[PDB]
Design a protein around this ligand. Structure first.
Ligand SMILES: COc1ccc([C@@H](O)c2cc(-c3ncnc4cc(N5CCOCC5)ccc34)c(F)cc2Cl)nn1
Lengths: 1265, 8, 512
């Protein structure tokens, strides 16, 4: 009847053990918990000496375990390793054994955790090398930058080889590893044995990725012995040899036998290894597939059957024991399944006699194989090579046991599979392997025609791909070897009829010409200087006509490709590769003045618009992101080719523009507001909720001209206005949302307005009369709001209180005209606060939401923050406003916003935030810029593998001085997370102790500057020198706990791999928002402008009040840091530092951002088209362009500091601190601009982490934490 | 001893 | 442990433990079920307690159950969670004190608001969950009165609206059955409650009603009169059934005949046309099969009007002459004739149009049989309005070879009821003043010499296509004729012999 909680221990212990005896994962957790609890208990008694003896015995036991196991059972190895992680006396386990164990069982996260905990508490080069090995096995080349510094006593060449491996450039990597191993002098010292082993292992890995089986075989067998080495038992000796050379020796020899090698050496080794029982167990448990293929070579089909079925059993047993949240271990475990099952299919096909007598079964098999491939861009090339080599061997076997065009039939399949592998290799940037594979395939390419054209097309696009990395004068060479054969006839009945191949040929030719011309534009004649038989090729006068003709032929081929495509997504690429090329030409000519250039580029502006609108007709996001460029191309060409865009826009889906509505409705007051009217008008009726608010802000100020055709311009706006508001539900919703904002704040609004009109000088006409309406209407005579809207319950008390001074205000202050006395105004505002009762404390402060209670089909509110752009809106599923909560809580700011929490029709509860005092158009434009970024960010391959995406909330401006912001669920500010991660004692010490940094910083400023308040900074800059500030900052930050973030992430992680995932995601997200907030320069990144999603660990940026550089340009104390990279953030990444993951993430993001700077620059044009309340706009965009085309961050900081704090008491010291020391900071030792992505990030983080800066910043910024 | 010691 | 810190708030564990408990209480295995179905039940017992009422844990349990009902595929969860809701109501009214069930989210009124929000929703599964919940709690709150009067009227109308939403949802997704059974359960409750307490109180105002403070019963039937011409098929159907079972049980027990007579005489005859045509009174491309949803929607409105007072004239409420005299000026007969004009004429929605085109022709035939089987006879108001030639060609093409007007052979239940309506129409026309047109029409394609010509030289073999399909259709049509009593009227014998010559020859054919 009720739960019988009166339960035994046996009824809990017994089932616990019963499950533990059934599931290895539950057994692993049970053992870990029991062991940790026992070792915790034995701390009470059993004092130091005996317990140290116990832990030493345990450490020896675990070393034993890790060194003696041969079947690396993942739960067992992981249990041992995380038990070791949990106890400090047990950390120093065995870095070599830990590495081998957790790398042989795909348990790298726990080993990484263990080695990082051991590297905490003469650099430990061995542990660092093992950690690097573990990280490298995962990928994680981002982390392998803060590992291999010279300050861990390690050579430069391993760093260079690893960063060569970061790009799939294994040829250079192996070429440097073998150089390292064969370098004798070594005049810095002698590399440690661990680093030598790292070089050899990485060399074997490189020769694995690059399919040189001869080199891999040699390098794997050359270490054990020489003189035809006896890999008969030597590998089984020296247990180091079994996890290092045995896998590679077997793989190399097998993959080499599979392609025809007669050699009967591996077979003997395997035969005599099966005599033993340990060797047989190792060899069957871990390979079971090499054995299958080896015995298929010997035609021993039955042993292949046994070994492959054993291998499937092993896959199953090993996969089911990998823990569920250990992704990318289950992925790599799953990547072998296709090879396993294809060996199985080959055995089944070759066994059944119904096959290999006719040809239909072989044809079906070839078909299925040609339609079954490993994934491109995801499956690494070892998997591809396994699949393709296995299939080639199978086809060879079937061929030689097929007596009854079959040779051509299978050669076609082999050709297709190898071409597919080559495409995949090119996409993954294994250029060396792609080139090699193309080489030995360029013999059968010509024995057919389609094969020849496919081969040359693949070759030339491969050359284009590898062109990007090369600087110049070399990429022209590489792409030039393409046109010499890309011009082959190929019309011999094939390009004549085959449209797709013609299109591809044209696009590739145009891209080659574009590459050559851009390279020669970069270096004008430097490339042509080194040219002997190339001057003819570039020439087909010498300075600019060459480039003009190159662009001309590129445009010709590209337009040919578009027209060929016009007769899907095969046309989208052509449309966009024309639009971007022509627009690139347009921007190129934009920064120069000429007439013949106009006459030659006059064909482009219309062509770009029409092609890109055709792209938008199709579902394209890469074009939808290019939309605001289509509006600057009309404002620049309004006397021509404008009606063309009207024709194109007329037929484009209605919703395809919901993102850019604020762009459009900011144009319906200017002369070319046509070409938009159709789209906005059909939006207004098709989706009458995505247009309401943007149109309300826009129509609030058009200020038409009515000079030529203003009548229709008003008419369209007015018919839209009538089309909207669907009665008065939206308008009175807005009005009620206005009359809970503090009236005092609206009152200082009018105060600042009037103080800027009459009290300065009586020369302003009719503005006083224009404002006369509002101050009677709002916070004036209490009858006025009752006449206008729902009279708030305060304004009658206001009129009663504001009667003695308001009498003269409304009687004689209409023409007060004294303009020099405002003390009465100041005191009346001050006393407005004496009797002020700001909080509503409940929802009767606005009697329209409190009693909303939807009762009629009143065009339901449909809660804002929706219509995110992408896709058809489907307004049906959008949430409607069912009501409002009774309680509203007010956020502690001077502008004192309220966060209301409103109930949707789904009866769920949607928190929100109202602030009716600010124009949030800037916050809306910043958020849509973030949308643009994480759109272009989602196109770069590097930024896509890491899944780099900004997190954005919905900012919906109701009207000027009234906005609505979406409150994201279950996120907490960074400051609160840090605070509640602390203990009570340290919380009290940090908050309520004058030795704490909050009080120490103020006392420092006071004692050195003599000022107890603001302005002590202006003198402090002229005061304490760099050494003093740095010393004070070091001592100051040495007083807060140094692992708050680490503790917070441990406490919410419940696992080793989970902690790594959360920490890496936090660091990745934070570095992304750092670089993004720098590109468009956002300041005031204090500890509350960061939210942490307590469900994912991601970071969210908040409160873009200081959108572009304005915390350094319009503040008493300026901000000189680019973003927030402070002590806690670095300490999160120990034992690594902020030169690994964060640096690499910022470099990838910056490369994606500067690969096409046009997007952001074009997007930020609304700031000048419709400037907001908070010369001015053009300069901000110019700065954003300049720090996006490569520019030293300190230079831009100094420029903004010049523009804002010129002729300041300490301006020169400001710029001195900002620019750097030239002997301590890399940002001062670099050119002003023309700067690389990597060097720019170097300087950027140097500025971010600078005690000469951080030691002297605004106190509220909380620099120490 | 059936140890929850109470009953809801 | 103490209330402050010794009581650890296990809300987070509950949020993730309750759903798996429900999933496990009902999955497949016997032993698991006997373990976990009770455990869930006494969990609901414990959490619905004056001690644990108005607690975050109870809210978590309720949200878990409600997410259980409104869910994708797993069927057993839906009904087990419905039983869970039933137990929740039972023990949240049993263990509780009545004056505490006021503001806590466990309150029955709040739960019903959640159910209603589920009902009105553009997802089929949420509406199905609301229907299941009511189908499980109906036995409660009716044995507990004093709240039936508050919101039974509110619940019934919005379940009707839920069914109206289900109209466009999908083809019999399983939500029409549940919603209809829900309103059925609510019918036999309301039909036993204000029999003697039909008092105009300020009961909870239902959606779609004009604001009022006295809504005892007459507003409901008046709303029915207003908008039972809706194009929502099952919704409209249940609405008219509710009308006919709700016009009794009124003060005076007055007959629907005098109800509709009084309504006509008090509000005008066109009251029964606008309400019975809605937006259908206010189209060439419909001749060809158009994928446009507007065509299907207008077909829907046509059918709604065609069936709405068709039921009223099949009943003795008001005859057709009153509602089709020179007083309505409707598009009824105009639309009928325009429809009959060119019905005979992507494929995927081609059949979508074709089926809905074919679901009305049978409605015209039953409509005509209704007209012809009523006391107010007289073809004058329908002499040649729809009853002209092309209606008869429709009848003859649905009598034989119905795969010409689009009747899909796949619809087994449609083409099994079809002979019934054909025979009923023909046997009603046998008494009609205009029967000769039927005779001539039928003679045009089925007659003796037509039989012998169709009785080709070869009938048995691999020629299953033509020699054995048209003949079978003709045989079926002749069987329908025999059922109607019109075998000889179309196929007479020869005066010379006494045996039916056609029958004798057909017997000889089969025997030989
Ligand atoms: C305990 O939380 C917090 C957080 C911050 C603070 C003060 O920095 C703070 C922040 C703002 C402010 N401004 C602009 N956008 C915002 C957007 C916000 N979002 C959107 C995304 O989802 C999460 C919430 C939140 C606050 C926003 C504000 F107007 C007043 C204050 Cl005093 N105080 N308390």
């Amino acid at each position: 009847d009720l739960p019988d909680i009166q339960i035994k221990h046996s009824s809990l212990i017994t089932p616990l053990q019963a499950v533990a005896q059934r599931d290895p994962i539950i057994a692993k957790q049970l053992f870990s918990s029991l062991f940790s609890g026992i070792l915790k208990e034995m701390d009470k008694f059993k004092t130091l000496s005996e317990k140290n003896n116990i832990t030493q015995k345990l450490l020896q036991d675990f070393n034993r375990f890790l060194n003696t196991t041969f079947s690396f059972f993942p739960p067992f190895v992981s249990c041992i390793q995380d038990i070791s992680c949990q106890h400090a006396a047990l950390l120093s386990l065995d870095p070599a054994a830990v590495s081998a164990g957790c790398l042989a069982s795909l348990q790298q996260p726990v080993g990484i955790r263990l080695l990082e905990e051991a590297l905490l508490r003469p650099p430990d080069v061995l542990r660092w090398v093992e950690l690097a090995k573990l990280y490298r096995s995962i990928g994680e080349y981002d982390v392998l930058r803060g590992i291999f510094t010279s300050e861990i006593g390690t050579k430069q060449i391993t760093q260079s080889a690893l960063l060569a491996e970061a790009r799939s450039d294994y040829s250079e990597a192996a070429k440097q590893y073998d150089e390292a191993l064969n370098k004798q002098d070594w005049v810095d010292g002698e590399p440690t044995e661990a680093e030598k082993d790292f070089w050899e292992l990485a060399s074997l890995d490189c020769y694995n990725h690059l399919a040189e089986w001869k080199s891999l075989e040699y390098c794997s067998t050359a270490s054990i012995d020489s003189e035809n080495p006896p890999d008969l038992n030597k590998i089984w000796s020296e247990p180091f040899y079994q996890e290092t050379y045995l896998p590679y020796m077997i793989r190399s020899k097998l993959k080499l036998l599979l392609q025809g090698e007669a050699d009967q050496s591996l077979l003997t080794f395997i035969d005599k290894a099966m005599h033993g029982e340990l060797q047989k167990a190792i060899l069957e448990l871990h390979y079971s597939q090499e054995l299958s293929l080896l015995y298929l070579l010997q035609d021993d089909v039955d042993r292949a059957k046994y070994y492959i079925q054993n291998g499937i059993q092993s896959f199953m047993q090993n996969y089911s024991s990998i823990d569920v949240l250990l992704h990318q271990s289950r992925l790599t475990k799953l990547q072998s399944v296709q090879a396993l099952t294809e060996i199985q299919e080959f055995i089944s096909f070759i066994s059944k006699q119904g096959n290999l007598s006719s040809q239909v079964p072989l044809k079906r098999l070839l078909n299925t194989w040609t339609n079954r491939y490993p994934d491109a861009k995801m499956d690494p090339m070892n998997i591809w090579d396994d699949i393709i080599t296995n299939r080639c061997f199978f086809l060879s076997k079937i061929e030689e046991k097929l007596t009854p065009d079959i040779s051509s039939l299978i050669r076609s399949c082999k050709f297709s599979m190898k071409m597919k592998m080559i495409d995949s290799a090119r996409k993954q940037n294994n250029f060396s392997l792609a080139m090699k594979l193309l080489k030995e395939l360029h013999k059968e390419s010509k024995t057919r025609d389609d094969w020849l054209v496919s081969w040359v097309q693949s070759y030339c696009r491969l050359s284009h791909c590898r062109s990007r990395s090369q600087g110049c004068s070399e990429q022209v060479l590489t792409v030039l070897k393409t046109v010499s054969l890309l011009d082959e006839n190929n019309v011999s009945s094939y390009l004549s009829k085959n449209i797709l191949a013609f299109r591809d040929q044209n696009i590739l030719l145009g891209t080659t010409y574009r590459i050559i011309a851009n390279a020669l534009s970069s270096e004008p004649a430097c490339l042509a200087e080194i040219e002997e038989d190339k001057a003819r090729r570039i020439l087909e006068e010498d300075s600019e006509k060459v480039i003009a003709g190159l662009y001309q032929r590129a445009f010709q081929h590209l337009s040919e490709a578009v027209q060929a495509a016009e007769e899907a997504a095969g046309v989208i690429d052509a449309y966009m590769t024309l639009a971007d090329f022509c627009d690139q030409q347009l921007r190129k000519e934009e920064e120069n003045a000429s007439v013949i250039d106009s006459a030659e580029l006059q064909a482009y502006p219309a062509l770009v618009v029409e092609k890109m609108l055709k792209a938008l007709k199709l579902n394209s996001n890469e074009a939808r992101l290019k939309f605001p460029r289509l509006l600057q191309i009309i404002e620049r060409y309004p006397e021509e080719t404008l009606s063309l865009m009207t024709k194109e826009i007329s037929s484009v889906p209605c919703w395809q523009f919901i993102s850019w509505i604020s762009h459009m409705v900011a144009l319906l007051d200017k002369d070319q507001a046509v070409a938009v009217q159709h789209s906005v008008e059909e939006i207004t009726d098709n989706y009458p909720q995505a247009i309401v608010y943007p149109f309300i802000i826009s129509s609030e100020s058009y200020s038409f001209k009515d000079t030529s055709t203003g009548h229709k311009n008003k008419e369209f706006v007015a018919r839209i206005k009538s089309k909207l508001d669907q009665g008065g539900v939206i308008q009175d919703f807005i009005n009620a949302l206005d009359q809970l904002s503090n009236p005092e704040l609206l009152f200082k609004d009018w105060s600042n307005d009037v103080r800027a009109e009459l009290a300065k000088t009586p020369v302003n006409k009719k503005n006083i009369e224009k404002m006369y309406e509002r101050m009677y209407a709002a916070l004036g005579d209490p009858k006025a709001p009752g006449l206008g809207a729902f009279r708030r319950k305060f304004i009658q008390t206001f009129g009663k209180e504001f009667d003695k001074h308001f009498g003269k205000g409304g009687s004689k202050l209409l023409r007060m005209k004294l303009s020099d006395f405002n003390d009465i105004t100041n005191m009346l505002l001050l006393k407005m606060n004496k009797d002020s009762k700001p909080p509503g404390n409940l929802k009767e402060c606005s009697p329209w939401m409190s009693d909303f209670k939807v009762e009629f089909l009143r065009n339901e509110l449909e809660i804002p923050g929706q219509y995110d752009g992408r896709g058809k809106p489907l307004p049906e599923y959008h949430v409607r406003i069912a009501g409002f909560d009774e309680r509203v809580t007010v956020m502690a700011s001077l502008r004192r916003p309220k966060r209301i929490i409103i109930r949707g029709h789904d009866e769920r509860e949607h928190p929100f935030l109202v602030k009716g005092g600010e124009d949030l158009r800037q916050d809306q434009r910043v958020e849509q810029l973030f949308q643009v970024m994480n759109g272009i960010l989602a196109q770069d391959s590097a930024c896509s593998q890491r899944a780099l995406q900004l997190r954005t909330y919905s900012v919906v401006p109701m009207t000027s001085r009234l906005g609505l912001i979406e409150w994201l669920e279950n996120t907490v500010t960074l400051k609160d997370l840090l605070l509640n991660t602390m203990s009570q004692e340290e919380k009290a010490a940090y908050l309520s102790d004058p030795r704490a940094p909050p009080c120490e910083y103020k006392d420092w400023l006071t004692k050195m500057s003599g000022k107890h308040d603001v302005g002590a900074y202006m003198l402090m800059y002229k005061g304490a020198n760099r050494t003093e500030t740095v010393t004070s900052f070091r001592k100051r930050e040495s007083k807060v706990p140094a692992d708050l973030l680490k503790r917070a992430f441990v406490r919410m992680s419940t696992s080793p791999e989970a902690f790594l995932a959360l920490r890496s995601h936090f660091a990745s997200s934070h570095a992304l928002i750092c670089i993004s907030h720098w590109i468009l320069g956002i300041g005031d990144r204090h500890l509350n402008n960061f939210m942490v999603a307590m469900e994912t660990g991601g970071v969210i940026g908040i409160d873009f009040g200081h959108a572009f550089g304005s915390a350094t340009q319009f503040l008493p104390v300026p901000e000189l840091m680019p973003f927030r990279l402070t002590r806690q953030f670095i300490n999160l990444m120990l034992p690594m530092k902020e030169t690994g993951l964060m640096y690499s993430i910022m470099v990838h993001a910056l490369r994606a951002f500067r690969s096409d700077p046009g997007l952001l620059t074009n997007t930020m044009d609304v700031f000048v088209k419709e400037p907001s309340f908070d010369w001015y706009p053009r300069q901000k965009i110019c700065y954003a362009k300049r720090k996006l085309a490569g520019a030293n961050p300190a230079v831009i900081t100094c420029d903004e500091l010049l523009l804002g704090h010129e002729k300041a008491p300490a301006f020169r010291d400001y710029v001195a601190v900002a620019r750097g020391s030239k002997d301590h900071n890399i940002r001062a030792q670099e050119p002003e601009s023309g700067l690389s992505e990597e060097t720019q990030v170097k300087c950027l983080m140097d500025q971010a982490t600078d005690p000469n800066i951080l030691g002297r910043t605004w106190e509220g910024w909380e620099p120490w934490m | 001893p059936n140890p929850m010691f109470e009953h809801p | 442990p103490e209330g402050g810190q010794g009581a650890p708030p296990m809300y987070q564990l509950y949020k993730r433990t309750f759903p798996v408990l429900l999933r496990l209480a009902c999955d497949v295995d016997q032993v698991t079920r006997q373990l976990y179905e009770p455990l869930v039940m006494q969990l609901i017992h414990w959490f619905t307690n004056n001690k644990k009422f108005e607690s975050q844990d109870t809210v978590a349990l309720l949200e878990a159950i409600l997410d259980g009902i409104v869910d994708p595929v797993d069927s057993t969860l839906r009904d087990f969670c419905g039983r869970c809701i039933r137990e929740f109501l039972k023990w949240s009214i049993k263990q509780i004190t009545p004056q505490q069930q006021e503001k806590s989210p466990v309150n029955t009124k709040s739960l019903f608001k959640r159910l209603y929000s589920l009902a009105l929703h553009p997802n089929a599964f949420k509406r199905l969950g609301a229907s299941l919940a009511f189908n499980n709690i109906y036995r409660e709150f009716r044995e507990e009165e004093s709240l039936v009067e508050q919101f039974v009227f509110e619940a019934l109308v919005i379940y009707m609206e839920s069914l109206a939403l289900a109209h466009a949802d999908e083809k019999s997704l399983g939500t029409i059955q549940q919603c209809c059974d829900a309103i059925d359960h609510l019918c036999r409750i309301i039909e036993k409650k204000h029999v003697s307490l039909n008092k105009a109180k300020k009961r909870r105002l239902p959606r779609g009603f004009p604001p009022s403070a006295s809504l005892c019963l007459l507003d409901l039937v008046k709303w029915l009169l207003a908008h039972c011409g809706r194009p929502q098929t099952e919704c409209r159907h249940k609405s008219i059934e509710l009308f006919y079972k709700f016009v009794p049980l009124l003060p005076g027990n007055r007959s629907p005949n005098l109800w509709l007579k009084d309504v006509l005489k008090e509000e005008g005859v066109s009251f029964l046309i606008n309400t019975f045509e809605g937006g259908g009174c206010g189209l060439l491309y419909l001749r060809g099969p158009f994928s446009l949803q507007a065509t299907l929607c207008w077909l829907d409105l046509l059918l709604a009007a065609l069936e709405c007072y068709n039921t009223f004239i099949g009943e003795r409420t008001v005859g057709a002459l009153q509602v089709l005299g020179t007083e309505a000026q409707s598009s009824l007969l105009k639309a009928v004739a325009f429809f009959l004009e060119s019905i005979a004429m992507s494929p995927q929605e081609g059949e979508r149009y074709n089926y809905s085109k074919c679901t009305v022709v049978v409605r015209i035939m039953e409509f005509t049989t209704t007209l012809l089987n009523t006391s107010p006879e007289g073809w004058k108001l329908l002499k040649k309005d729809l009853c002209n030639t092309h209606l008869m060609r429709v009848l003859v093409q649905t009598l034989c070879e119905p795969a010409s007007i689009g009747f899909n052979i796949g619809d087994v239940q449609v083409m099994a009821h079809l002979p019934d309506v054909c025979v009923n129409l023909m046997k009603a026309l046998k008494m009609s003043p205009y029967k000769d047109i039927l005779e001539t029409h039928l003679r045009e394609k089925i007659t003796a010499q037509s039989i012998e010509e169709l009785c080709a030289v070869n009938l048995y073999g691999p020629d299953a296509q033509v020699d054995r399909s048209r003949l079978a259709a003709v045989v079926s049509a002749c069987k329908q004729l025999h059922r109607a009593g019109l075998l000889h009227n179309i196929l007479p014998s020869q005066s010379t012999d006494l045996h039916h010559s056609v029958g004798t020859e057909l017997l000889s054919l089969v025997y030989k």
